[PDB]
Design a protein around this ligand. Structure first.
Ligand SMILES: OC[C@H]1O[C@H](O[C@H]2O[C@H](CO)[C@@H](O)[C@H](O)[C@H]2O)[C@H](O)[C@@H](O)[C@@H]1O
Ligand SMILES: OC[C@H]1O[C@@H](O)[C@H](O)[C@@H](O)[C@@H]1O
Ligand SMILES: OC[C@H]1O[C@H](O)[C@H](O)[C@@H](O)[C@@H]1O
Ligand SMILES: [Mg+2]
Length: 580
């Protein structure tokens, strides 16, 4: 008896009418005295319906260009479905009924079957478009990943950016392609049996191109702020519906299989039903198999067990792994010792901080909650993602940080890809890509100057506003064909094939997973009715024979995969082996 709050009849923005009758335009404003729509250059006064709702139907079709005029001020549509001239321009009317989907035999993907591959459309290919990305889908399928995780696509200002400055949440960013180019990418992925997930940002709007306050200041509150502006007021139903209607668009109209909710701790809501719960209700109402993930640092199981999200990006594993390999201690890295015994614990517990004191200077508090309720798929683990590369001054990848060997990098891959938690890889990780992933932006005027200045002060550091910073982050595909890039890629292919094929690694129960250490050797054991597997990773500086590792059980004898392809059960520094 949950009923969606959305009815296509009353949808805000511009929606094609049945029977070729044109387009229905609707908006909500709490303050405007005169309200019109300007379509293809012609102004038309809209009808006041009450409650600040205004509507007009005109015989214009998909492709018509428009914006709204509030007290005489031309104002972009916050509900725009496409913005061909960017965030300050006219919107285009879009009909989602026109695309010829071919994915009727695709039925989504379960979280326990996901191996995510995080793509930034702008840098993933030279062209930096959906069409060029779609051409790499056969590569990704053969690699062995199963779900692409696309960084945010809502239109933002400028000609490149990560996506977190999105301002028109319903409008796919024009430089990447038109709406039908995005649909083509999703359809192609589905035809290859790959899922596609979208990063959405429901805790803030970017600094340029968000005109919601022009319609109603009450979308936002002064009670709290975001990085860019006034906080999103989830006590206001139109604000709630702005994001739930957006989530439903991406899933239903673009056929995404799931959403990754950025920075869920900053979606503040004291309503009886939290906006996260309502998001889950609203997407479920669609009657599909779509998933919701939370990017959440609180180590809070309620995101799954109370808000009914499917899983959580949980950085403690990432951080413990990075500190193990570099020893770094700046910022949040000070929260971790690293090492075999530390990694064994963090894996055992899913996340490390379950209520203990987080002693990181400037952030001190009792962090986290017991992880017992969560099962292995609920934790999304990684050793690289956009933030853990890009939020470093030089945007360097794990194998490029001082002190990290390619052997250690390859061992880390074996640990991540044999665990029953849900793994994520960042584009290019699989071939030890040579290029960084730096923070880049392209804001106008003073705002652009402020971003450059802000980055300099924060931490030579690449200027985020420089074209070169964007280009330096482009993947170099050709390099994967040679040398250590190719060797790394072969290992990633072998690990992803084992993950898929090995009947014991199919385990998705923490009950069947145990961990421990002997000195600097980590061991991770899986026992099911199908057999036993043990991953051993030598995080020491010396060579360790498997036979000399002290274990509380009898080590399996058969060598299934060695990260440096050795024939014998011995681990050089940084190396790992899976036995069975
Ligand atoms: O060498 C001085 C540091 O030793 C420890 O850190 C090392 O050993 C950790 C495992 O116990 C590794 O995770 C880490 O990468 C190494 O740097 C100690 O934890 C540090 O406080 C010392 O400064
Ligand atoms: O973006 C998430 C990060 O926010 C940080 O400020 C926290 O220190 C850390 O726990 C988390 O990794
Ligand atoms: O201003 C009238 C009203 O507009 C709306 O219906 C908003 O949902 C409401 O919270 C506000 O009070
Ligand atoms: Mg020992």
């Amino acid at each position: 008896s949950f009923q969606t709050q959305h009815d296509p009849r009353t949808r805000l923005g511009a929606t094609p009418l049945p029977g070729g009758a044109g387009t229905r335009f609707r908006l909500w404003t709490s303050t405007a005295r005169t309200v019109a729509v300007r379509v293809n250059g012609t102004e038309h006064v809209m009808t006041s319906l009450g409650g600040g709702i205004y509507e007009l139907e005109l015989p214009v079709g998909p492709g018509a260009r428009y914006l709204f005029v509030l007290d005489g001020v031309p104002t972009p549509d916050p509900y725009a479905r496409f913005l061909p001239d960017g965030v300050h321009g006219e919107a285009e009317v879009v009909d989602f009924g026109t695309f010829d989907w071919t994915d009727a035999d695709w039925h989504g993907i379960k979280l326990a079957d996901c191996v995510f591959y995080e793509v930034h459309v702008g840098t993933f290919t030279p062209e930096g478009t959906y069409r060029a990305a779609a051409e790499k889908l056969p590569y990704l399928k053969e690699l062995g990943v199963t779900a692409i995780q696309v960084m945010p696509l809502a239109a933002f200002d400028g000609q490149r950016g990560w996506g977190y400055d999105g301002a028109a949440f319903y409008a796919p960013y024009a430089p990447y392609g038109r709406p039908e180019d995005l649909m083509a990418l999703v359809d192609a992925a589905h035809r290859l049996g790959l899922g596609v997930f979208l990063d959405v940002v429901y805790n803030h709007f970017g600094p340029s191109g968000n005109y919601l306050s022009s319609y109603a200041p009450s979308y936002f509150t002064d009670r709290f702020s975001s990085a860019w502006g006034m906080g999103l007021d989830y006590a206001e139903p139109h604000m709630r519906r702005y994001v739930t209607g957006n989530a439903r668009m991406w899933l239903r109209d673009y056929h995404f299989d799931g959403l990754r909710l950025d920075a869920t701790p900053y979606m503040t809501d004291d309503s009886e039903t939290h906006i996260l719960t309502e998001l889950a209700q609203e997407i479920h109402e669609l009657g599909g198999t779509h998933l919701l993930l939370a990017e959440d640092h609180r180590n809070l199981p309620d995101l799954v067990t109370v808000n009914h999200l499917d899983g959580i990006w949980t950085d403690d594993f990432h951080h413990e792994t990075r500190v193990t390999l570099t020893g770094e201690q700046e910022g949040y890295y000070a929260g971790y010792r690293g090492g075999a015994e530390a990694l064994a614990y963090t894996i055992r517990r899913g996340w490390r901080y379950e209520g203990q004191f987080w002693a990181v200077k400037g952030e001190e508090h009792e962090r986290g909650h017991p992880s017992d309720a969560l099962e292995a798929p609920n934790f999304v683990y990684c050793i690289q993602n956009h933030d853990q590369i890009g939020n470093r001054p030089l945007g360097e990848r794990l194998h490029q940080s001082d002190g990290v060997t390619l052997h250690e990098y390859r061992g880390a891959a074996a640990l991540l890809l044999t665990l029953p938690m849900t793994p994520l890889l960042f584009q290019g990780q699989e071939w030890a890509a040579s290029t960084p992933f730096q923070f880049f932006s392209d804001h106008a005027g003073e705002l652009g100057q402020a971003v450059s200045e802000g980055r300099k002060k924060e931490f030579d550091v690449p200027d985020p506003q420089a074209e070169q910073t964007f280009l330096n982050s482009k993947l170099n595909w050709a390099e994967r064909e040679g040398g250590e890039h190719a060797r790394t890629l072969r290992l990633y292919r072998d690990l992803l094939r084992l993950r898929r094929e090995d009947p014991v690694l199919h385990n998705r129960q923490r009950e069947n997973l145990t961990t421990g250490h002997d000195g600097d050797v980590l061991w991770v054991r899986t026992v099911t009715g199908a057999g036993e597997r043990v991953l051993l990773w030598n995080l020491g500086q010396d060579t360790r024979a498997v036979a000399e590792v002290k274990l509380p059980f009898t080590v399996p004898r058969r060598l299934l995969l060695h990260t440096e392809g050795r024939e014998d059960l011995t681990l050089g520094a940084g190396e790992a082996v899976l036995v069975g």
